[PDB]
Design an enzyme around this catalytic site. Sequence first.
Site, PDB file in Angstrom:
ATOM      1  N   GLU A  46       0.852  -1.180   0.000  1.00 22.29           N
ATOM      2  CA  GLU A  46       0.000   0.000   0.000  1.00 22.29           C
ATOM      3  C   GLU A  46       0.893   1.235   0.000  1.00 22.29           C
ATOM      4  OE1 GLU A  46      -3.114   0.121  -0.505  1.00 22.29           O
ATOM      5  OE2 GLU A  46      -3.708  -1.965  -0.161  1.00 22.29           O
ATOM      6  N   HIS A  83       6.738  -0.972  16.986  1.00 22.74           N
ATOM      7  CA  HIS A  83       6.983  -0.363  18.284  1.00 22.74           C
ATOM      8  C   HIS A  83       7.965  -1.212  19.075  1.00 22.74           C
ATOM      9  CE1 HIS A  83       6.248   2.723  21.183  1.00 22.74           C
ATOM     10  NE2 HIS A  83       5.124   3.112  20.609  1.00 22.74           N
TER      11      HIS A  83
END
Lengths: 84, 84, 75, 58, 75, 58
Positions: A46, A83
Amino acid sequence: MLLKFTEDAWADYCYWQNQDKKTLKRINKLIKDIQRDPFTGIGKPEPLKYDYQGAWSRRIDAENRLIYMMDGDSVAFLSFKDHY
Amino acid sequence: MLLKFTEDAWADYCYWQNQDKKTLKRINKLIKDIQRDPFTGIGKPEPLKYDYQGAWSRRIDAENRLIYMMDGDSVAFLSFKDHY
Amino acid sequence: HMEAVLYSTFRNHLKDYMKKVNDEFEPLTVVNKNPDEDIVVLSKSEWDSIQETLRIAQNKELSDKVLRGMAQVRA
Amino acid sequence: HMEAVLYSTFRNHLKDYMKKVNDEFEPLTVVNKNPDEDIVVLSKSEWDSIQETLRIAQ
Amino acid sequence: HMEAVLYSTFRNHLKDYMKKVNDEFEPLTVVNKNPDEDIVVLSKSEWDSIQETLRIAQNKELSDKVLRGMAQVRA
Amino acid sequence: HMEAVLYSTFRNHLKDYMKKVNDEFEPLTVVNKNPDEDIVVLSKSEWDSIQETLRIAQ
């Protein structure tokens, strides 16, 4: 098709090298598929918009994404972990 | 249909009273619809699970949820604003 | 700034307007009498692009990592 | 919070889905046989919030 | 744990298993030979409730306000 | 996001769909005729990731 890594991406790549061989294999499968065609293929590529225009995203798993961009005859990875 | 508010839920309701007239009217319509039936109606009623078992949810808008629960013949409101 | 259309013209040329937001790659509001009743119709492609961009934007640490890296790749 | 519907079901119940889009605040993907006709349907309320967040990222 | 259904049993009796997940309100996992292809099959009702619960558990502030509130109401 | 699949198409191409949800990490809804028999299919990876978040809350 050169493979660029930023410092932060290589740090991400080496984290998965030490932890989780399965995720490392997934990342590697994505890198092979990117090398075949950076715009299509597995991991639902994407393109990103707005201040991240030029960057692209594929899905390592449900929580992590592979951020990369193409500048000419090379692919440049920006991230392999979402993260810490 | 007795109506209960927690201290925090009342602060949420008082926030929308001074902030947006339009949110206040939507909240009021949901409360009206909870009174006719707390488990069905507009706002997509949805029961919560696991540590929130017993609580229910309705959509105030895209960002904020109406969170309530039963206490026999009463509805106890828990929140009118998702995050501050 | 978004192209606004009437619900009537929308329901009439339904399948044609679906082909428009994909070809044009542009969002489109269909407006009604109630200013809240109006809705946005968008291509699933653009939606996936917005959502993936949003997930990066919501994470400041990763946004900082991506934007910094992107600066080093261009520089 | 996303719901999905096929095009045939979405076309037969067009008006009922347009109302529910702005009451349940749940975007709807209209899946087709041709994916280049796929659309997402959401309330304008939700769009302005999405654009507000992207604006905050700046 | 979770009920595990073989891939071919699930495929042959898919209509039946679409009923079981909606009446037992319980998740099933479908397994083939390659465990990288394992899927979880859920009721669409349960999925919407799980998404709602999950939206709360991601808001630490909203999670506390709700949880503290249920205690006051239980008393 | 969410995709919708005809239950006959889901049944005929099951192995391909279990590959797709585990590659793209998106849920899909399988529709039949009775809407109270609608199911959501998702990857074992994404499922474990959600249960992990729900127990982290505790």
